[PDB]
Structure 1
């Protein structure tokens, strides 16, 4: 039919089937259902499949990219459309241990990562001298070489963005408690989790509410399910700045 005509129809079957809210159905389940309809339509040989195993494919924790929702409404609406759905902000941002896991690949320039880090650090921290419970976001990167990761870490320190990684000196073992003190440290801007092994040891040392914001392009890491997560898939790393 028309573009508008089937828009109110297609979300109606998914709404009562899973019994979730509007953004958990129209934005979370209906968006993923459009790709895997197209993923088998563009298959060269097996075009028609049985949909018995389709209803559990799209109920993953992830929120996949929709290229047709990129091409129609453009990048201004779509990144705003993703921002308003899962990253609903409040006036008073509570001191929660927020983890920002971003996929790092060699096609990404080192300059645009810092502007994403500067956006995450400014929007998700309150390092004021007057607050009694200061908070600072956690940053995790994956998929890249350690040589490219250290160049990003070394560049941020020269621009007076002081961070901690659980490695306070050369040859140190991983100290998870340094990130907890850095969470309450007003002179530490954010925390830089080195890898996935340093990630899961950090959740065991934090007792306050923890949120995980995952922003990948191709590969998404397996996160524990009880943690509140937002796994948004994007085209490029520069799009992550306009959603956080």
Structure 2
């Protein structure tokens, strides 16, 4: 069990090597059988590892979060808990009834007070890709269903038994 989790860390993720401010996209497979608590541990581990919002730096970066396969009932409720625990994010909807605004995701990438970025669906994700100009890397962790990632994006796909192992690899 612990040797299965060791090979996935070293082969694909390379957490210590990669520190440049890249538009890193973390696509996670949210299902009904997994609970919100384990998703929040994965989100907190992704943000704490792949963002640098320290005051000393001059090139801050924040990760991008995308979830698929789940309903909007627990996707919005996970979003509601995360804002209550002072993990401030953006998703391109700064007010109620807004259209999707990629610029709010762009400014939140360099904003030190915004910890990560949420992406609601696939159409928000594809519209975000054409708006970021800097280098983008896509990391996907999934259990059953994968996602159609554009072929010109540097992509990795990682298969896990369930959602609990993702926070170790990240």
> Same fold judged by TM-score > 0.5?
yes
Written as runs of structure 1 = structure 2, the 5 A alignment for 1:96-111 is 96-111=22-37
- Secondary structure of residue in 2 paired with 1:76: coil
Measured in 2, the distance between the counterparts of 1:226 and 1:123 equals 25
Q: Which moved more, 1:87-96 or 1:126-135?
A: 87-96
- Secondary structure of residue in 1 paired with 2:3: helix
Residue 186 of structure 1 is matched in structure 2 by 112
Q: Which moved more, 1:87-96 or 1:183-192?
A: 87-96
Q: Which has the larger radius of gyration?
A: 1
Query: 2:15 touches 2:49 (CA, 8 Å); kept in 1?
Result: no
Query: 2:32 touches 2:70 (CA, 8 Å); kept in 1?
Result: yes
Deviation at 1:150, TM superposition (A): 0.5
Measured against aligned partners, the alpha-carbon deviations of 1:89-122 in whole angstroms (never above 9, x if no partner) come to: 3456000000000000010011010000000000
- Secondary structure of residue in 2 paired with 1:121: helix
Measured in 2, the distance between the counterparts of 1:105 and 1:160 equals 25
* Paired residue total: 170
Residue 84 of structure 2, aligned match among 142, 147, 158: 158
Query: 2:92 touches 2:103 (CA, 8 Å); kept in 1?
Result: yes
Compare relative contact order (CA 8 Å, sep 6+) and give the higher one, 1 or 2: 2
Judging by fraction of residues, say which structure has more strand.
2
> CA 1:92–1:143 in structure 2 vs 1: closer, same or farther (change >3 Å)?
closer
Residue 142 of structure 1, aligned match among 68, 86, 89: 68
Deviation at 1:206, TM superposition (A): 0.8
Deviation at 1:87, TM superposition (A): 1.1
Deviation at 1:225, TM superposition (A): 1.3
What residue ranges of structure 1 are gaps of 5+ in the alignment?
1-74
- State the TM-score, normalizing by the size of structure 1: 0.68
> CA 1:224–1:92 in structure 2 vs 1: closer, same or farther (change >3 Å)?
closer
Measured in 1, the distance between the counterparts of 2:148 and 2:82 equals 28
Measured in 1, the distance between the counterparts of 2:52 and 2:40 equals 19
**CA-atom RMSD in angstroms:** 0.9
What residue ranges of structure 2 are gaps of 5+ in the alignment?
none
- State the TM-score, normalizing by the size of structure 2: 0.97
Q: Which moved more, 1:225-234 or 1:95-104?
A: 225-234
Measured against aligned partners, the alpha-carbon deviations of 1:19-47 in whole angstroms (never above 9, x if no partner) come to: xxxxxxxxxxxxxxxxxxxxxxxxxxxxx
Deviation at 1:79, TM superposition (A): 1.4
Deviation at 1:132, TM superposition (A): 0.9
- Secondary structure of residue in 1 paired with 2:54: coil
Measured in 2, the distance between the counterparts of 1:222 and 1:91 equals 27
Measured in 2, the distance between the counterparts of 1:198 and 1:232 equals 22
- Secondary structure of residue in 1 paired with 2:2: helix
